[PDB]
DNA sequence: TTTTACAGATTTTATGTTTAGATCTTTTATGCTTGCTTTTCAAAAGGCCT
DNA sequence: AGGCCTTTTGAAAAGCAAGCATAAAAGATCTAAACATAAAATCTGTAAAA
């Protein structure tokens, strides 16, 4: 109708008043629909306890990097002078994204203002000056507890006699790699004349997200020699000095200490996806670990057994599920192959439910500390050895594999400690229902998918998305069409893939016209009982082409706004250009 | 047959099919010799073939992916945004998911319903100032004061930043479900709209349920946009005939 | 990379990225590309060997 | 040199390559896989141009 | 729809019905705030307004943005209770009728009826205006002259207000003697606007120096389209180089060709290389009758 | 008890300031066509060999 | 009497390069919308005097 013709129509969905059930949580009935409702409620509450215990530590680390950074910047912003006294202090914040709040100290009988500047707040030099002096007059006349001045450096000249305090303005350029440096060095030149006023103290703070050889290549050399008077650098990045990856991954183990385990493939996938992204890694760490936890409690019924009170709700289907673990198969093969007691394996094979039901609850008192010993290796490398360039994720990966000694000899600094820093752990039976893992490609398919490859796969093959049927063909309208005829927009792509770079739309139409059935669609087209217009065009002696051009032009103008087809030669639109290739 | 390509589609399929073809080997055939139709014959056979070619397999597919809905509600209520890419129209999926399923389940669980702001982003008349006008009466936030507004700044982006720092001291319940159809459409792929919709997804109290159509879509979002969205991607390609949106675009002869 | 002004394009005002008429170009010089190809250890000196 | 990722460094290198190389001479420098169908690769440039692009 | 200009003040002027206290604030946002005012508190009553000259409002915002948007917005007839709030449209001349779009043309409200109202047989119309009389006639207008007037008006579009200022002028030129005289006006205003293409062209020029210069502008068109008066004067000393003459004589004799109504000299962009203003030359009539005008002058034949 | 009448608040009108996006023109850039030429390969001409 | 295999080998496919065209970049010039200020008429709310 006409409601999908206007943008942003808000819609209130009306609702039935109540259904009076427990359907207030999304956790479905697992074990092919055999689970109890109280176990689903306990699973939801247990997942929320785990998720809250994780994120209450993640938030303290994330709100502690700001209390570390404000402590860092505000120490080399102050407590130092230069003998020239006609220079501005300059701090290059390397690798920093513009997300930090800066605090300026008391320093009484002197104002301290912070003038944040942006590539949107700087289209030329005069808007920078008007915004800077506007922020100066605002943060000077509102921090005092009346005339109108002009917003230029004259306010900086007579700031001493307008207010009575000395000025100390601290500039702050947010995306220094995104401003014009031609506007920025003009602003620095325009600021340089403020030196002669004896009550100012300009400080510049550059938030650079690239290296320093790309800022002093684009600036002019006189501005660079002015900036070489009192400059300091400061590396602000959460990959330098692995302290905040060794506090998010450390805190993830404090929630899963004994209840859950991590796989080998999972930690190497974490390391592969944390290394292909540098700007934000404290967020791509947490949104992989939480989505690993969310795909666990939604899938694994045995999560209800990670609390040692729910041990008595072992139904028959839990005993069916746990029995077909291959580590238990390895254990039972062990009980066969070393010695032969008959009537114990005959019990625990398929008959006795009580022995297997009480046997599994012994397997939860075990700890086998991977994450209980890895903190000892972390404390040994940080305190006793004083090496602060190690990664807890990669050390944990090698400790999980077992080649930890190679990673400890990667430094060649702890040769007398390769026995003290050694730990060879084994597997405990029934790990493979209690492990966070990725062997199905779930964290790949729904966090970092091959987007274009999935679109092209669904366009080309299309049988992995559309079903085939064997009963619903006679009550339908097209029963014999789903088996002999590919879907248009999925059939045209088979000709689009094996075409050239320049595709003539008439040849692209003829190749589509002779891959359709002729003697089927001329029978099919007369099926409709209601309308009468669709049958008279079948009484026309050129029905097949006039039904073929409709489907072809529909598929072409459907590909075009998807991105696979560029119509070159405007005012012709006859020779299209293939512009997406499969497999790339 | 009409392509002499040694390789097919990889990087060497790109390098191989980009050759140079002579003037006599070319086929300069205008599409005038295609048998012309009327507008109403197209309009008739189109709506016939939409719901009468693969109708029961597509309904079977929608019932297959319709038991996926509790995972979508779980991912929304745990903080993520959703992104539904795929072949075909994702329109009726989000009209049958967000209106029917989602907001009744959200409204019951925190105990009228939860307001659903649909946003037809395939319409090129999609300004962000009237869309943010439509957001600021479904939430009604505070106004921009004199100290918090700046010298000729953007009031929409500053208001969303003020809402972001307001909603860190609040209970975490969904207050709106923002349903964007064709998020990479011709008037919403631009930068300030995406800055708006990326700063809205920072708020936990609004669930973004987006959909894309173009294939080079993920390069609209850098390390700041793709971090404030924190999308989870779901290929729900269901081969829909996509006839709500094609009335907007040119169907010129 | 487009945000960090390292690859760049024809700056029409608020250009759409998803058009088949917007083409891209690098605007970093050779002297940093040699250091980059030294960092990942990529032999790029023999890619422009057939020009000088 | 730069605090970038591996794929971003290779994207910078590949964008540096394709915006200084002529588009016709890349199937002589990168095409390496065995054919199954009768095809010919790019021959490459005959004379090295010493204008230094 | 006069004092609107922008799509901003559509709804306040129709609000003098009960002269309410509300009207400025609640109404001008939304269609549901005018759906709030469609139900009638004071009985069924009636209030149908006729917004006049409605094509004048929708001619803004330069693509569709807030005017054509408003025409696809204010033709919704969605809810139909017992409420008399219809609005017939008063569209102007056919300037942007044949430009449409599918939102304007697909089943919402008062669209699919439009009629050309051209008054053919306006002779009977004049007969109705004169027979509906308050001042008895003796000698009526001759219907041969009435049909000649109705013939010589309705060829362009068929304006009736144009024809109403013709018979009035005919009896106004009748009163200047103190169908035989209701014809020289049209034979007067057709000839006055036309003047003479070639018969009076040289007649008014009578001067040869006011004749061959028009040929200089004719030769200054099929070499250059930026015909500067300098270029009209560099062509002048590429033709007569075979009492001096300065540029002032040329540019003041061009005022005669300006005064008659052939030539246009004003400042234009002057594209060229630099973009500052200079004088131009342009001619209007087609070179068919002027090429027959030179068939009598033996010196304007080699210059063609 | 209304109707006035000062105070203050909100509207009206009018012009100033900054940002974002359109049209049109000039100058360089890219692709198309036509004749000639230089590579790689695949059919083959023919000697070696079972 | 037969398969093979390496020098030689057409030869049709890549490469090259002047000649007109036409898209496309870059910028000049313009304009509309968001954004801000402000004085005077106008609305209105609280006592206003009868």
UniProtKB/Swiss-Prot annotation, chain A:
MF term (GO), any: DNA replication origin binding
Principal location class: nucleus
Protein localization: Nucleus
BP terms from Gene Ontology: DNA replication initiation; pre-replicative complex assembly involved in nuclear cell cycle DNA replication; silent mating-type cassette heterochromatin formation
Record's keyword terms, sorted: Acetylation, DNA replication, DNA-binding, Nucleus
InterPro entries reported for this sequence: EF_Hand_1_Ca_BS, ORC3, ORC3_N, ORC_WH_C
Any single Gene Ontology cellular-component annotation: nucleus
UniProt similarity note: Belongs to the ORC3 family.
Biological function: Component of the origin recognition complex (ORC) that binds origins of replication. It has a role in both chromosomal replication and mating type transcriptional silencing. Binds to the ARS consensus sequence (ACS) of origins of replication.
Summary of subunit composition and partner proteins: Component of the origin recognition complex (ORC) composed of at least ORC1, ORC2, ORC3, ORC4, ORC5 and ORC6. Interacts with ORC6.
Protein name as it appears in the record: Origin recognition complex subunit 3
Source organism of the structure: Saccharomyces cerevisiae (strain ATCC 204508 / S288c) (Baker's yeast)
Gene: ORC3
Curated annotation (Swiss-Prot), chain B:
Entry superkingdom: Eukaryota
Disulfide-bonded cysteines: none
Subcellular location: Nucleus
Other comment: Present with 1700 molecules/cell in log phase SD medium.
Assembly and interaction partners: Component of the origin recognition complex (ORC) composed of at least ORC1, ORC2, ORC3, ORC4, ORC5 and ORC6. Interacts with MCM10 and TAH11.
Summary of the function given for this chain in its UniProt record: Component of the origin recognition complex (ORC) that binds origins of replication. It has a role in both chromosomal replication and mating type transcriptional silencing. Binds to the ARS consensus sequence (ACS) of origins of replication.
Family: Belongs to the ORC2 family.
Protein name in the entry: Origin recognition complex subunit 2
Biological source species: Saccharomyces cerevisiae (strain ATCC 204508 / S288c)
From Swiss-Prot, chain C:
Positions in coiled-coil regions: none
Transmembrane segments: none
Paired cysteines (S-S): none
Subcellular location: Nucleus
Signal peptide boundaries: none
UniProt family annotation: Belongs to the ORC5 family.
Purpose: Component of the origin recognition complex (ORC) that binds origins of replication. It has a role in both chromosomal replication and mating type transcriptional silencing. Binds to the ARS consensus sequence (ACS) of origins of replication. This subunit is a candidate for the mediation of ATP-dependent binding of ORC to origins. May also be a substrate targeting component of a cullin-RING-based E3 ubiquitin-protein ligase complex RTT101(MMS1-ORC5).
Assembly with partners or alone: Component of the origin recognition complex (ORC) composed of at least ORC1, ORC2, ORC3, ORC4, ORC5 and ORC6. Interacts with ORC6. Component of a cullin-RING ligase (CRL)-like complex composed of at least the cullin RTT101, a linker protein MMS1, and the potential substrate receptor ORC5. Interacts with RTT101 and MMS1.
Additional remarks: Present with 768 molecules/cell in log phase SD medium.
Protein name in the entry: Origin recognition complex subunit 5
Provenance organism: Saccharomyces cerevisiae (strain ATCC 204508 / S288c) (Baker's yeast)
Entire-sequence positions represented here: 427 to 478 of 479
From Swiss-Prot, chain E:
A GO-annotated cellular component: DNA replication preinitiation complex
Keywords: ATP-binding, Cell cycle, Cell division, Chromosome, DNA replication, Nucleotide-binding, Nucleus, Phosphoprotein, Ubl conjugation
Claim: Kinase is one of the keywords in the record: no
Molecular function in Gene Ontology: ATP binding; ATP hydrolysis activity; chromatin binding; cyclin-dependent protein serine/threonine kinase inhibitor activity; DNA replication origin binding; GTP binding; GTPase activity
Biological processes, Gene Ontology terms: cell division; DNA replication initiation; G1/S transition of mitotic cell cycle; MCM complex loading; mitotic DNA replication checkpoint signaling; pre-replicative complex assembly involved in nuclear cell cycle DNA replication; regulation of DNA-templated DNA replication initiation
Tree of life domain: Eukaryota
Entry coiled-coil feature ranges: none
Presence of the UniProt keyword Manganese in the record: no
Induction: Transcribed at the end of mitosis, but in cells with a prolonged G1 phase there is a second burst of transcription in late G1.
Range of residues in the leader sequence: none
Subcellular location: Nucleus; Chromosome
Description of post-translational modifications: Ubiquitinated by the E3 ubiquitin ligase complex SCF(CDC4), DIA2, and TOM1; and targeted to the 26S proteasome for degradation.
Family in the record: Belongs to the CDC6/cdc18 family.
Subunit structure, interactors included: Associates with the ORC complex and the MCM2-7 helicase complex. Interacts with CDC4, CDC28, DIA2, ORC1, and TOM1.
The protein's name: Cell division control protein 6
Species in which this protein is naturally found: Saccharomyces cerevisiae (strain ATCC 204508 / S288c) (Baker's yeast)
Lineage, top ranks: Eukaryota, Fungi, Dikarya, Ascomycota, Saccharomycotina
Whole-protein residues included: 172 to 512 of 513
């Amino acid at each position: 109708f006409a409601d999908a013709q206007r943008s942003h129509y808000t819609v209130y969905p009306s609702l039935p008043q109540s259904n009076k059930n427990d359907k207030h949580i999304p956790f479905v009935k697992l074990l092919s629909g055999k689970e109890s409702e109280v176990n689903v409620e306990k699973r939801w509450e247990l997942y929320h306890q785990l998720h809250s215990h994780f994120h209450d530590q993640v938030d303290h680390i994330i709100d502690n990097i700001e209390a570390d950074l404000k402590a860092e910047i505000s120490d080399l912003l102050y407590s130092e002078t230069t003998q020239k006294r006609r220079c501005f202090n300059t701090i290059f914040l390397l690798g920093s994204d513009s997300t930090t709040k800066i605090e300026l100290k008391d320093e009484s009988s002197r104002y301290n203002v912070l003038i944040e500047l942006t590539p949107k707040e700087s289209p030329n030099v005069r808007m920078m000056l008007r915004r800077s002096m506007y922020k100066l007059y605002s943060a000077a006349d509102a921090e005092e507890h009346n005339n109108d001045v002009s917003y230029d450096l004259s306010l900086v000249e007579n700031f001493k006699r307008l207010f009575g305090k000395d000025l100390a303005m601290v500039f702050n350029f947010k995306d220094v790699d995104s401003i014009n440096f031609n506007t920025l060095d003009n602003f620095i030149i325009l600021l340089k004349s403020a030196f002669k006023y004896d009550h100012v103290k300009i400080s510049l703070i550059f938030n650079i997200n690239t290296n320093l050889s790309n800022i002093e290549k684009n600036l002019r050399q006189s501005t660079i020699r002015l900036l070489k008077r009192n400059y300091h650098k400061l590396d602000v990045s959460s990959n330098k000095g692995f302290k905040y990856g060794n506090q998010i991954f450390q805190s993830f183990l404090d929630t899963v200490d004994g209840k859950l385990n991590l796989s080998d493939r999972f930690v190497e996938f974490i390391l592969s996806k944390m290394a292909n992204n540098t700007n934000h890694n404290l967020q791509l760490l947490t949104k992989m670990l939480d989505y690993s936890l969310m795909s666990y409690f939604f899938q694994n019924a045995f999560s209800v057994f990670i609390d040692p009170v729910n041990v008595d709700f072992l139904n028959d289907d839990y005993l069916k599920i746990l029995s077909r673990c291959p580590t238990f198969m390895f254990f039972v093969e062990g009980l066969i192959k070393q010695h032969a007691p008959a009537d114990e394996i005959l019990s625990l094979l398929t008959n006795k439910n009580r022995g297997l039901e009480e046997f599994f609850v012994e397997f939860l008192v075990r700890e086998n500390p991977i994450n209980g010993h890895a903190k000892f290796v972390a404390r040994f490398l940080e305190e006793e050895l004083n090496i602060t360039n190690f990664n807890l994720i990669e050390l944990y990966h090698n400790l999980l594999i077992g080649k930890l000694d190679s990673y400890l000899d990667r430094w060649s600094a702890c040769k007398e400690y390769k026995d003290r820093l050694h730990f060879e752990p084994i597997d405990t039976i029934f790990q493979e229902l209690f492990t966070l893992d990725n062997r199905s490609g779930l964290l790949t398919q729904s966090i970092f998918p091959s987007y274009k490859s999935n679109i092209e796969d669904n366009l080309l093959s299309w049988e992995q998305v559309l079903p085939s049927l064997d009963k619903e063909n006679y009550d339908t309208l097209s029963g014999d069409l789903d088996k002999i005829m590919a879907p248009v927009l999925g059939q045209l792509f088979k000709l689009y893939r094996e075409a050239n770079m320049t595709i003539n739309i008439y040849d692209f139409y003829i190749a589509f016209r002779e891959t359709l059935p002729k003697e089927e669609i001329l029978n099919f087209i007369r099926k409709d009982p209601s309308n009468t217009k669709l049958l008279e065009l079948a009484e026309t002696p050129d029905a097949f082409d006039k039904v073929a051009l409709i489907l072809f032009m529909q598929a072409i103008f459907a590909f075009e706004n998807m991105g696979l087809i560029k119509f070159q030669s405007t005012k012709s639109y006859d020779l299209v250009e293939k512009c997406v290739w499969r497999g790339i | 047959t009409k392509s002499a390509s040694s390789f097919l589609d990889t990087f060497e399929g790109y390098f191989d099919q980009r050759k140079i073809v002579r003037t006599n080997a070319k086929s300069r055939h205008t599409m005038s010799m295609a048998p012309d139709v009327t507008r109403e014959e197209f309009s008739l056979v189109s709506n016939f073939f939409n719901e009468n070619f693969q109708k029961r397999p597509r309904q079977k597919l929608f019932e297959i992916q319709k038991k996926m809905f509790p995972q979508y509600w779980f991912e929304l209520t745990q903080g993520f945004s959703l992104l539904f890419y795929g072949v075909g129209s994702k329109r009726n999926f989000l009209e049958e998911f967000a209106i029917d399923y989602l907001s009744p389940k959200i409204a019951y669980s925190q105990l009228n319903s939860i307001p659903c702001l649909i946003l037809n982003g395939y319409n090129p008349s999609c300004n962000y100032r009237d869309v943010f006008k439509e957001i600021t009466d479904l939430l009604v936030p505070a106004e921009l004061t004199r100290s918090e507004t700046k010298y000729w700044g953007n009031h929409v982006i500053l208001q969303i930043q003020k809402m972001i720092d307001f909603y860190k001291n609040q209970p975490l319940d969904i207050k709106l479900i923002l349903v964007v159809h064709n998020l990479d459409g011709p008037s919403i792929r631009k930068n300030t709209f995406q800055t708006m919709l990326s700063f809205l997804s920072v708020i936990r109290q609004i669930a973004i349920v987006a959909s894309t159509d173009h294939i080079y879509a993920p390069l609209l979002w850098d390390n700041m946009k793709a971090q404030n969205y924190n999308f989870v991607f779901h290929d729900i390609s269901n081969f829909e005939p996509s006839t709500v949106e094609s009335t907007f675009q040119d169907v010129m002869k | 990379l487009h945000t960090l002004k390292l690859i760049a394009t024809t700056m029409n005002k608020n250009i759409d990225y998803l058009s088949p008429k917007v083409r891209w170009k690098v605007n970093v010089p050779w002297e940093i590309i040699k250091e980059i190809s030294e960092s990942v250890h990529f032999n790029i000196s023999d890619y422009f060997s057939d020009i000088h | 040199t730069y605090d970038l990722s591996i794929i971003s460094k290779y994207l910078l290198i590949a964008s540096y390559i394709c915006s200084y190389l002529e588009p016709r001479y890349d199937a002589s420098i990168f095409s390496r896989k065995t054919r199954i169908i009768q095809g010919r690769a790019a021959y490459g440039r005959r004379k090295k141009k010493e204008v230094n692009p | 729809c006069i004092s609107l200009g922008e799509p901003s003040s559509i709804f306040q002027k129709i609000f003098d019905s009960f002269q309410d206290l509300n009207g400025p604030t609640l109404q001008i946002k939304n269609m549901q705030h005018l759906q709030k005012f469609l139900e009638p508190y004071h009985k069924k009553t009636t209030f149908v307004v006729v917004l006049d000259e409605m094509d004048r409002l929708l001619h803004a915002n330069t693509s569709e943005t807030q005017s054509v948007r408003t025409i696809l917005e204010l033709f919704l007839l969605a809810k139909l209770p017992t409420v008399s709030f219809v609005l017939i449209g008063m569209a102007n001349s056919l300037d942007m009728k044949d430009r449409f779009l599918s939102r304007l043309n697909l089943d919402r409200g008062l669209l699919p009826q439009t009629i050309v109202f051209q008054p053919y047989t306006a002779e009977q119309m004049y007969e109705i205006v004169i027979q509906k009389m308050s001042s008895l006639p003796t000698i009526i207008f001759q219907p041969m002259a009435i049909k000649f007037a109705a013939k010589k008006c309705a060829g362009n579009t068929g304006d009736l207000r144009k024809l109403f200022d013709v018979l009035r002028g005919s009896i106004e030129i009748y009163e200047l003697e103190k169908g035989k005289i209701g014809l020289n006006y049209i034979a007067k205003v057709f000839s006055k606007f036309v003047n003479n293409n070639s018969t009076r062209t040289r007649i008014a020029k009578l001067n040869i120096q006011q004749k061959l210069i028009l040929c200089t502008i004719i030769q200054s068109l099929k070499l250059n389209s930026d015909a500067t008066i300098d270029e009209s004067f560099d062509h002048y000393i590429k033709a007569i180089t075979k009492a001096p003459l300065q540029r002032n004589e040329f540019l003041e004799i061009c005022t005669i060709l300006e005064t008659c109504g052939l030539v246009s000299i004003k400042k234009t962009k002057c594209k060229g290389k630099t973009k500052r203003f200079v004088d131009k030359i342009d001619v209007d009539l087609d070179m068919r009758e002027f090429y027959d005008e030179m068939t009598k002058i033996s010196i304007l034949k080699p210059f063609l």
